Design a protein around this ligand. Structure first.
Ligand SMILES: [Mg+2]
Ligand SMILES: [Mg+2]
Ligand SMILES: [Mg+2]
Ligand SMILES: [Mg+2]
Ligand SMILES: [Mg+2]
Ligand SMILES: [Mg+2]
Ligand SMILES: [Mg+2]
Ligand SMILES: [Mg+2]
Lengths: 65, 149, 235, 161
RNA sequence: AUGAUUAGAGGUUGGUGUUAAUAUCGACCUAUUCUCACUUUAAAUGUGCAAACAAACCUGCCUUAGCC
RNA sequence: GCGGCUAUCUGUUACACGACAACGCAGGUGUCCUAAGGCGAGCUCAGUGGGAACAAUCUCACGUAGAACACAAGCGUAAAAGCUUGCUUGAUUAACGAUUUCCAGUACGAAUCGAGACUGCGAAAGCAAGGCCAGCGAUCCUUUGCG
RNA sequence: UCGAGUACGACCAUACUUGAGUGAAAACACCAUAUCCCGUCCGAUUUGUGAAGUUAAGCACUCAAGGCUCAGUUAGUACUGAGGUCAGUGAUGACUCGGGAACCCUGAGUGCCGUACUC
């Protein structure tokens, strides 16, 4: 006995939770490789840069302090 | 529950409109999509290779993926007590670049360019005027109303 | 007609109902992978007509197909014999005449050496300026002026990809570097077999020297690489 | 007046013999010199089969002749039948033709090893400007409102005859 | 319109009751007709989205994947 | 209880997103194709309106699909996706990566977007990992391949 | 030499298709030919190759009808969301608070623009 009655009011008790925003689980994975294989190598460099930018900081913040 | 195929109950939904059939546009082939813009997933027939399921027809959503000839679109789907960000894979012809933001794309384009004109800009050209207020209105034709039979 | 037919009649695409464009070939040429976001795709749409020929490099734009650097065979006669307009070699003539001025319009001076001036059996393309060939509705019978302009372009710095499977020198095995190099420059025995003996029978392409007609083009080839502008004298 | 004149496009003499075999064993050969262009066949879809022909079977030994070589071979459809048939054969568009049960009625010879076939020199006149109604590129209409008609037919029917 | 559903006004195609002259009902031919499922971006009610501190700018990185 | 259908497919039910039931209605399925697959080119179908020794077919008109598309039905397609021909095996391996539908967001089945080869058909852009979407099967066991 | 002319097009009938009119330069167009690649059973189609020629078709320009597009109605009509301890009849009917058609008919007009060249 199919009814669908009380179901729309069950889905709205604890609320129909809104979707997660885009900054949640934005895993550009399973997508088109030639993009993510480039958006990978550019992440490696931008991490060598993030590590390098902190290296001068501390060393500038040492001598210049 | 005899039939629930991938294309069920969709006679009028995928049917082309009246006197507009045949091949897809050259605009729809010359569109330009990025990862992130919005797209109306308006599944048209006459391509019949890459149409999404019925559900994702009036639906618009982010492009999370642009393969060579398939746009990947996330779409919010209110399943039962939560929405899934579905990840559909369709071809480009089933896709419009969604206007849904020209409402403030074109607003803040001239709204700021005049807020700047109003804040700093160069000058402040007067803009749209007031809408709802009073007034001693002068009539131009009197009338009455009783009946018409 | 008459009635309720032209009510539900759908008018076909405006060029198609009467005109040239083929909107199953149109939509497959200008089409490009949606990854390469607005990367320019330049065609090589060439049209042979009866009196003349028309070849211009086109990219499709949303505003309408934006032609860049059109080049005809009514401007090469301002540097050539003007005795053969639809000549297979005249196709080759405008082939590089189109191929050159694009590089002169693209500022491309490095690959502007192009290819060798002499007719080649075949060349393999990729770095250089690239385009795709649009015959339109002109067919692809082995040998055609839509294809002299092709090889005329490719031998002139264009990267219009092609195989030899449909060249006049091509036969059941490969492409004859002898059977082509003639037609690409001249095969004037078409006049020294009938039109030379035209007076030898009775009353009847005058002024033509079948001893220079071949060289009458080899003058124009090396000139194009020197005079790309080569516009017909206006005014 | 220059291009306003009519000239027969093609006289595709059609033979419609029965089912294939030794029935069409000499038809094409003695039809290889009436026009010098190889005769054709006709793969049938209906093939009523009361004559014998079935689906996709060689029955109608088609041909096709045009140009000046047909205009001259029209002087045989205008040789026999007293060079004039009934004006009730003028088509709605201006086509007409002759034909006899005697193949050897022409300069042909009813050789012994061949059955007594014939031909049907059904020709179709038409002015210049029909090469615009069918073009693989840049088509158009038939070029209506100036063409051959059942009245202009009986003009050139007995003008060039 | 895909179909209708059909009789009312009379006139190509079959059989036929007639004295090359005539109908006769079907098919048809017409102006229609009657009232229905098939038709049309044709509602109301709906529903998908977006709407302010990086969604626009003025800029500048780096690998340059794209394109010469 | 006999009778008949549980796995599935289209329309309808079904109410203009989606969802939606009934031994609820109407129909189909458990296949069939080395071409009825793939591609390129050429062509335009059902019908009709008239025409030719024989007498169908060659004639040209007008022909928005009234046909065809392996089949049920519905969408869809007209310089084709149908018709004819050509050349072919992409109906293959797929590093399978992701996704869709059923959904519990689990299989399965069928699809969609890809990647890597190796390829075929094309002058080319492109098209093809079957014939769209029904046509199918866990643990264990047997069995072959894999080295 | 100026509007348009071809060829490329984007919207896709205001653009369609009809009976004509119209074509002044060019430019398309039919046109000549099997002397070659070519594939035509065919010089039809196309595909070698050019200009005796021709506006006869084609094509764009003009009017001027179905159809199409825009509106005036149609009509606050039908229909509809909501509300009655509304009224009867279990037929929808009106009301109130709103949304609000269509077919038709009387109209309006019967394409528009965008890149190169050429004049
Ligand atoms: Mg809501
Ligand atoms: Mg089927
Ligand atoms: Mg069927
Ligand atoms: Mg396909
Ligand atoms: Mg399932
Ligand atoms: Mg699976
Ligand atoms: Mg299947
Ligand atoms: Mg396919």
């Amino acid at each position: 006995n199919h009814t669908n009655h009380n179901q729309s009011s069950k889905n709205h008790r604890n609320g129909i939770k809104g979707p997660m925003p885009l900054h949640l689980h934005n895993s550009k994975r399973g997508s088109w490789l030639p993009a993510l294989v480039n958006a990978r190598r550019v992440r490696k460099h931008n991490q060598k840069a993030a590590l390098k930018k902190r290296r001068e900081r501390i060393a500038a913040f040492a001598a210049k302090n | 529950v005899h039939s629930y195929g991938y294309k069920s109950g969709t006679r009028h939904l995928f049917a082309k409109k009246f006197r507009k059939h045949g091949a897809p546009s050259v605009s729809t082939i010359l569109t330009n999509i990025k990862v992130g813009d919005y797209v109306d997933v308006v599944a048209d027939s006459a391509v019949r290779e890459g149409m999404p399921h019925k559900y994702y027809h009036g639906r618009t959503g982010i492009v999370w993926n642009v393969t060579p000839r398939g746009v990947g679109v996330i779409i919010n789907k209110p399943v039962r007590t939560r929405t899934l960000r579905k990840r559909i894979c369709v071809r480009f012809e089933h896709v419009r670049k969604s206007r849904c933001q020209e409402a403030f794309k074109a607003k803040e384009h001239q709204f700021q360019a005049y807020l700047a004109a109003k804040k700093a800009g160069k000058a402040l050209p007067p803009l749209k005027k007031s809408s709802r207020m009073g007034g001693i209105v002068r009539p131009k034709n009197v009338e009455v109303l009783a009946r018409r039979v | 007609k008459n009635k309720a037919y032209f009510k539900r009649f759908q008018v076909k695409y405006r060029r198609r109902r009467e005109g040239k464009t083929d909107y199953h070939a149109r939509r497959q040429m200008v089409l490009q992978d949606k990854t390469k976001f607005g990367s320019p795709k330049y065609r090589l749409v060439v049209r042979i007509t009866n009196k003349d020929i028309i070849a211009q490099i086109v990219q499709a734009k949303i505003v309408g197909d934006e032609v860049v650097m059109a080049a005809y065979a009514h401007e090469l006669p301002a540097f050539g014999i003007e005795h053969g307009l639809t000549n297979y070699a005249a196709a080759y003539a405008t082939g590089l005449l189109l191929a050159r001025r694009t590089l002169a319009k693209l500022g491309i001076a490095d690959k502007f050496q192009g290819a060798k001036e002499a007719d080649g059996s075949y060349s393999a393309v990729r770095f250089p300026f690239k385009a795709i060939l649009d015959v339109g509705l002109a067919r692809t019978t082995t040998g055609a002026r839509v294809f002299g302009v092709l090889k005329g372009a490719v031998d002139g710095g264009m990267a219009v990809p092609h195989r030899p499977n449909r060249f006049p020198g091509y036969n059941k095995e490969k492409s004859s570097l002898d059977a082509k190099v003639h037609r690409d420059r001249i095969f004037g025995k078409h006049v020294a077999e009938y039109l030379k003996q035209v007076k030898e029978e009775a009353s009847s392409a005058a002024k033509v020297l079948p001893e220079s007609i071949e060289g009458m083009y080899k003058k124009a080839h090396a000139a194009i690489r020197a005079d790309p502008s080569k516009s017909l004298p206006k005014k | 007046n220059p291009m306003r004149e009519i000239v027969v496009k093609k006289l595709c003499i059609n033979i419609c013999v029965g089912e294939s075999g030794d029935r069409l064993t000499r038809a094409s050969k003695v039809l290889e010199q009436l026009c010098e262009q190889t005769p054709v066949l006709s793969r049938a879809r209906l093939t009523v089969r009361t004559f014998g022909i079935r689906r996709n079977e060689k029955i109608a030994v088609h041909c096709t002749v045009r140009g000046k070589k047909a205009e001259e071979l029209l002087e045989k459809g205008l040789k026999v039948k007293e060079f004039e048939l009934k004006s009730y054969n003028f088509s709605d568009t201006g086509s007409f033709g002759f034909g006899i049960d005697e193949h050897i009625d022409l300069g042909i010879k009813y050789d012994p090893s061949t059955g007594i076939y014939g031909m049907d020199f059904y020709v179709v006149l038409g002015r210049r400007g029909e090469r615009v109604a069918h073009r693989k590129r840049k088509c158009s209409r038939v070029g209506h409102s100036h063409h051959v008609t059942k009245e202009e037919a009986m003009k050139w029917f007995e003008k060039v005859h």
